[PDB]
RNA sequence: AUACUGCCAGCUGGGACUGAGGACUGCGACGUAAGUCAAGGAUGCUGGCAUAAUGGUUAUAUGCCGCCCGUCUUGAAACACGGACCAAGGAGUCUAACGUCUAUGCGAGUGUUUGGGUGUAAAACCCAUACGCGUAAUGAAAGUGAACGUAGGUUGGGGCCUCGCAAGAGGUGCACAAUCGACCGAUCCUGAUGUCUUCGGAUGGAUUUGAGUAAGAGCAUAGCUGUUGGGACCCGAAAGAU
RNA sequence: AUAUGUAAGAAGUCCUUGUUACUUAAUUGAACGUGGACAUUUGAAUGAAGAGCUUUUAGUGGGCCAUUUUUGGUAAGCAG
RNA sequence: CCUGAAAAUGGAUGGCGCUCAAGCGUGUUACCUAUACUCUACCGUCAGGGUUGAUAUGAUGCCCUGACGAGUAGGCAGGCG
């Protein structure tokens, strides 16, 4: 017998090996693996687990987010990468000349950076122009703000919007919400 | 690149090299151990003959194996096993004697059987059953490289630099001493010598302190 | 593939510790020492053989 | 499908994943939303504080289109501007040709100011306006004209 | 009967609902139908729109 | 019928098996339950502070 | 039935002492306490406002607050699995400066003499404790301090 | 100059179990120079037998061990309950509305399928309405409605931007967490120009409050798991009613 | 005695304020800062098996028995 | 050691039997054997790694290294029908 510190036969609890089945995706999976291992860069091997990510663990990044990585001091002719999709934002009336590599392109995200004369190329086209990841700039979407985490850590006193179906006067605004009827939270 | 002699003979250039110095090394130990030994012994004679005792220094290392199974221990020395890695029946580590962990095998003392290792049994615990920590992997020394891949850096490049910090407790003791696995003991050959283990060594049993008898029983489970 | 203990497979033993040759060859295992009648004091003996 | 799912991994386990000692029983606790207030006051206080009770005044007849207003912000106001028209007005901003923007034909009631909009002018026909929004946009040179 | 956090419902079925289901597998065969029914009276006011 | 009425045995051992660890401890506490008048007026310190950096680095 | 009050099992815990009752010498109003002090929490029975709860007697804890009277204390509480912060609002009376606190703050000013002393000739003057070693070999002289034999006594009864 | 203790990288024997593993490498040892070796795991030689001889199966005998399964239970072999035997049948399902997660498409949008058009006819294929959800919140409501800062400051922060040849920093830092701010609604305050003198409405605020803003992330389909209503895993009342 | 809180530092330490509407008689302080001085010892020991974190959901919510402490009871294979 | 010492079927230092014991107290050894310990093989699991090499070897392929393995209620996974 052993006196067991941890517990055994535990797995690693990170993804490996993406769990969805597109071909293209784990093509793009056995060229980053062979990356991560033989070229010592830093980036390709964050590039490599961001593969296996799940949907909600890549959100998307709307080519504003790009525009203001791209105002970042020095970053200007950065290669803008995000493994994910790029959507197209119409909140912003300028884009410059980037290049963006990227999962997937909306339709106004691709016709907006070729419009301002940049490029949109997959990570395959990034992987001959930079193996070791020069001059990149990864762009991560927020990750926090979707529908689903304001309802997480819900309970008396912490502000995390209720599992609700209709809303307005009539639906949970009473006993429990306010002084007048009862307590608040 | 023709490669059949350049390469190979200064890798065996700089291996005869690494000999020599390990040898040189391992003299200057033998020196040294002999000399503690004896200098011991004419102090010894010195104040007996000037009316006067000679009181031998505290051991400042003890070799603790683990007599006991895991089922039925309290919490306390459970995490003090733990902490000195002995978590298996018949487990031994090295301890460098101090306050702080006397106190520690003070709370053990039921379950372990220990003592003060002589330089014979840590060279034969180490070359017998000597195994290194290298990523997180038990791999067995069976080479000086293992060992001076892993504890180079505090300048032990041989199994006898890494015997010399342990006997000798050393500036390095923590990092050799955690470098080895625990050692994996066997029943003792010849038995306990005891009808029953689990009393003190002074009340006839087995566990406890031990102060040079651990030899004879390390010996005889190694 | 297969792990040789010293103190048997004495090339083993040597591969790990050049000395081994000569700790041998000069039999430091039995090695004599020179000797001098340092007598130890009589209260010393009083004192052990002491009632 | 039913191939994967649990109810066949249970096969010729006793009690199907439901514990032998607290079985499956058919209402242990009530049905639907039963003690609420009672025995399952702990999960309704946990989870959905404001349940029991009433809040405000009674609307008879309420109807929903009387309230119909959906809001434009600012910042996506150009959006309503057909895409071909819309690079050349950017360029040639100017007055005496600005662009009409009908919000109401969009399907908008009121417009809200989200702000930044370019400074080219524009016409913009509301029904309801914030202040800020019409603020914004006469900087931009435009105007906000009401639109019943 | 209630349990862990999740939205409160309200499924109207505490009525013998089951009798009163109507399944729309006639889509297509309506269709059809209506399409027939709009062919034959065409027909029958054959200048007529 | 009477039951066990209580026992906190088996609760040290379940409190231990995922159990213990202190609180994480950050740079920045919240300003929460500090004395308003020094929120208030740490509140205009800050302030100037930028306001005093931005313009050395201008 | 059963009596959980804020004070129950306080008997001896917020008594007084052994003639020190009445009023509190000054020097417990003149102690500063500043965020982020170290500070012992031993509640003092003769004023009843402010007083801690008995669990946070003997606790110690770091100051964030300081008010007119009071010093807000937190202390971190072991609930279930888990510890919670806890924000106690004490007056001055309940609490005392940690003094291992201002222990460690002198050895830290030592530690910074000492190193810049062994900076002036590098002598690895190594600032970190040890624990107590194992003696050195020492010899013991008889002169004067001839052994003295000893023995077991024989029983006897002594009553 | 010795029944004790310690050490020997001292010597000489007698037994047992094991032989894992490469189409080519390592670390070493041994003679002063063809190279050998017990050095990163067995080879050499010699027999007998190519068959039920070894072995698999099965029956018995022998040695030792072996209470009847399922169930409820702290506790069952129980002097607790079901079970004489066998075959076939026999028990977590489908749907409405959903939570988490995951996969897929498109993406500030998304959903063709009420319907229309077609059709090789319930398929498939096509459709430049509306509607649902999302894109705005907050308040009981009337209502009001999200950047004067590079969409802020601070801490951390992966990744990226030089190398100097063996201590080795600086710059940029979009996920995210902590924190101080700013903006929107509500509440509580100020109440300016102006004026059907009783309306109008802050730039000024407040240990107040919101399921908010602060360069969108959602919509749809499918799957496991979990939820609620349903006969609701299967069987089972004493009853009640027409 | 046993048990128990805290501390043993890089979010730490050493300058006439740099800020404030707080505070002080007062540049007095308080809080938070810019620049300066500190990687093999980063300020006890031992260990660390990867940290930290999130979501969601099952079963369970009859317990019982040593040693030691201990209550009621003469006691109990009793009750707590 | 004996008396004190009485219960119901026949009866239990486990049984036989044991009397300088095979009893009792103690000392010293030798010897026996667990699914425990040491070492080795094989299975699985988990972990950490290697591998874009020739006119043979899909890179969830091939391979190296280490540790570990009890399990009701229960969860998950890979499979069988």
């Known amino acids: 017998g052993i006196d067991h510190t941890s517990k055994q036969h535990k797995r690693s609890g990170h993804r490996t090996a993406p769990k969805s089945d597109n071909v293209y995706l784990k093509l793009l999976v056995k060229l980053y693996t062979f990356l991560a291992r033989r070229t010592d860069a830093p980036f390709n091997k964050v590039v490599l687990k961001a593969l296996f990510l799940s949907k909600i663990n890549r959100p998307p990044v709307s080519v504003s987010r790009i525009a203001r990585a791209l105002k970042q001091e020095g970053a200007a002719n950065k290669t803008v990468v995000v493994v994910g999709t790029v959507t197209d934002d119409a909140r912003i009336f300028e884009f410059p000349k980037t290049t963006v590599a990227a999962l997937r392109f909306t339709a106004g995200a691709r016709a907006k950076i070729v419009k301002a004369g ?66 608040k939270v | 690149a023709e490669q059949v002699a350049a390469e190979r003979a200064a890798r065996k250039a700089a291996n005869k090299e690494k000999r020599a110095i390990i040898l040189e090394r391992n003299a200057a130990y033998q020196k040294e151990y002999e000399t503690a030994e004896r200098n011991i012994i004419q102090a010894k004679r010195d104040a007996k003959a000037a009316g ?113 910090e342990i006997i000798t407790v050393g500036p390095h003791f923590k990092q050799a001493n955690n470098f080895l696995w625990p050692f994996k003991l066997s029943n003792p050959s010849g038995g306990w010598g005891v009808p029953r283990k689990f009393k003190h060594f002074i009340q006839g049993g087995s566990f406890g302190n031990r102060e040079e008898f651990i030899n004879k029983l390390v010996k005889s489970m190694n | 593939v297969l792990k040789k203990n010293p103190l048997k497979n004495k090339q083993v033993l040597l591969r790990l510790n050049p000395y081994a040759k000569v700790f041998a060859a000069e039999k430091l295992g039995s090695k004599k020492a020179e000797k001098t009648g340092t007598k130890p004091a009589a209260v010393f003996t009083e004192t052990l053989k002491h009632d | ?145 009401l639109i019943a | 009967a209630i349990s862990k956090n999740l939205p409160i419902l309200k499924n109207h079925f505490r009525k013998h609902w089951q009798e009163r289901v109507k399944v729309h597998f006639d889509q297509a065969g309506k269709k059809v139908s209506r399409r027939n029914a709009r062919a034959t009276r065409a027909a029958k006011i054959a200048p007529r729109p | 019928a009477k039951s066990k009425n209580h026992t906190a045995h088996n609760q040290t051992r379940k409190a231990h098996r995922n159990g213990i660890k202190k609180p994480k401890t950050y740079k920045y506490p919240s300003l929460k339950g500090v004395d308003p008048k020094f929120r208030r007026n740490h509140k205009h310190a800050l302030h100037g502070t930028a306001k005093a950096l931005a313009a050395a680095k201008k | 039935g059963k009596s959980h009050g804020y004070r129950s099992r306080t008997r001896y815990m917020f008594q007084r002492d052994f003639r020190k009752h009445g009023a509190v010498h000054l020097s417990t109003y003149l102690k500063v306490y500043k965020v982020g002090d170290i500070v012992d929490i031993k509640a003092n029975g003769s004023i009843q406002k402010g007083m801690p709860h008995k669990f946070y007697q003997g606790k110690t804890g770091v100051v964030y607050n300081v008010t007119k009277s009071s010093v807000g204390v937190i202390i971190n509480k072991m609930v279930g699995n888990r510890y919670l912060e806890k924000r106690l609002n004490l007056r001055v009376e309940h609490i005392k400066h940690s003094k291992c606190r201002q222990e460690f703050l002198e050895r830290v000013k030592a530690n910074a003499a000492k190193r810049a002393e062994a900076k002036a000739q590098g002598v690895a003057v190594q600032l970190k404790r040890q624990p107590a070693q194992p003696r050195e070999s020492r010899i013991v002289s008889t002169e004067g301090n001839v052994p003295q034999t000893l023995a077991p006594v024989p029983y006897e009864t002594f009553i």
């Open chain 4, 1 to 145: 499908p039913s191939r994967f799912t649990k109810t066949r991994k249970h096969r010729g386990h006793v009690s199907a994943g439901k514990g032998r000692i607290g079985k499956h029983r058919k209402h242990p606790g009530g049905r639907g939303m039963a003690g609420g207030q009672h025995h399952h006051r702990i999960n309704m206080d946990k989870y959905h504080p404001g349940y029991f009770g009433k809040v405000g005044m009674r609307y008879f007849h309420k109807q929903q289109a009387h309230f119909w207003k959906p809001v434009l912000n600012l910042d996506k106001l150009w959006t309503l501007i057909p895409e071909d028209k819309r690079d050349q007005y950017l360029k040639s901003a100017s007055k005496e040709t600005a662009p009409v923007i009908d919000t109401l034909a969009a399907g908008y009631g009121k417009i809200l100011g989200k702000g930044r909009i370019p400074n080219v002018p524009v016409i913009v026909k509301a029904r309801f306006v914030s202040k800020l929004a019409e603020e914004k946009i006469r900087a931009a040179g435009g105007v906000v004209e």
């Open chain 1, 118 to 183: 940049g490029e949109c190329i997959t990570l395959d086209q990034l992987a001959v122009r930079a193996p070791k990841g020069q001059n990149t700039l990864i762009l991560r979407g927020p990750r926090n703000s979707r529908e689903a985490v304001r309802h997480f850590g819900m309970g008396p006193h912490k502000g995390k919007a209720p599992r609700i179906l209709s809303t307005g006067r009539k639906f949970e605004r009473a006993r429990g919400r306010r002084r007048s009827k009862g307590f």
């Open chain 2, 52 to 164: 006067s005792y000679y009181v031998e220094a505290q051991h400042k290392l003890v070799f603790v194996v683990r007599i006991k199974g895991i089922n039925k221990i309290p919490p306390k020395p459970r995490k003090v096993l733990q902490l000195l890695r002995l978590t298996r029946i018949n487990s031994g580590t090295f301890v460098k004697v101090t306050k702080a962990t006397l106190e520690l095998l003070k709370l053990i003392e039921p379950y372990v059987a220990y003592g003060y290792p002589s330089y014979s049994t840590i060279r034969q615990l180490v070359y017998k059953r000597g195994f290194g920590k290298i990523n997180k992997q038990r791999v067995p020394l069976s080479d000086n490289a293992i060992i001076e891949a892993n504890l180079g850096k505090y300048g032990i490049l041989s199994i006898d630099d890494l015997i010399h």
